[PDB]
Amino acid sequence: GSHMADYYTSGKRGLAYNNINLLTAFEGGPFSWSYNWEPRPGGYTAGIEYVPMLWGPRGYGSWNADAEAGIAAGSKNLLAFNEPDIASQANMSPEAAAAAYQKYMNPYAARARLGSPAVSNGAPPKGLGWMQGFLDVCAGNCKIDFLAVHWHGPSGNVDDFKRYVSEAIALGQKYGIGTVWVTEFEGQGDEEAQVNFLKEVLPWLDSNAGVERYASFFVDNLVKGGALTSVGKAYKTI
């Protein structure tokens, strides 16, 4: 046998990290997966699925070796470009990203489920306008298993957060993509506001048949002095 008996001992909640060392503060919570906006994890975290990301064109030279490595470590999923709708992020036209998705994501479709580029919640032409332009140019020749989407906004705009997620699920369903991952969400405001935001959205996300996975933004903000903040505690316990 390749394993000892102790290896045989919602599932949606994720750990979006910069410093791998801060994941430890989340020990024993309901976390199934992690990602780091990088193609490589920066170390090893037992018992959680690391999902490599192709962040953008700066990543293209090493991606085949990165993807092969994360699949070999047990990854069932890969994520494409980060906020190509945003100039300060991947900064890619829908046309450019459709060609790049076919070249760099499609080849792994037999060995992993593939996640769309992740769009901001910007107004068209950003956000879900960008995703529509990308799905137009893809024209059925992009192999996409799930849409990846982001929402940052005032903590008191929970209804807008729910509208955005619902519109993302409907867009995916129109194009033959059956689920979304909300790979970043941030309700902006002081700690009490951020905790109240999590108390309304986490159960709604957990109940939403359209949402396969999500990650609050983000681990490194939820930890201080090696300890979960009141916001990190809410993210673990709700």
Please provide the DSSP assignment of 127-141 as one string: HHHHHHHHHHHHTT-
Cα(83)–Cα(89) distance, rounded to whole angstroms? 6
Selection from 141, 146, 78, 140 nearest residue 112 by Cα: 78
One-letter amino acid identity for 10? S
Resolution of the experimental model, in Å, one decimal: 1.8
Residues 181, 184, 190, 194, Cα dihedral to 10°? 10
- Report residue 160 CA to chain centroid gap: 19
Q: Is the peptide bond before 125 cis (omega within 30 degrees of 0)?
A: yes
Structure tokens belonging to residue 108: 């792994």
Helix locations, the chain, DSSP H: 63-72, 94-104, 127-138, 158-174, 191-207, 219-222, 230-237
Structure tokens belonging to residue 201: 């959205």
Do 154 and 189 meet the contact criterion of CB atoms below 8 Å apart? yes
Cα(225)–Cα(89) distance, rounded to whole angstroms? 29
- What's the number of CA atoms in the CB half-sphere (13 Å) around residue 227? 3
Cα(134)–Cα(148) distance, rounded to whole angstroms? 13
- Give the method of determination: X-ray
Cα(147)–Cα(164) distance, rounded to whole angstroms? 13
Cα(142)–Cα(145) distance, rounded to whole angstroms? 10
Structure tokens belonging to residue 191: 């700690």
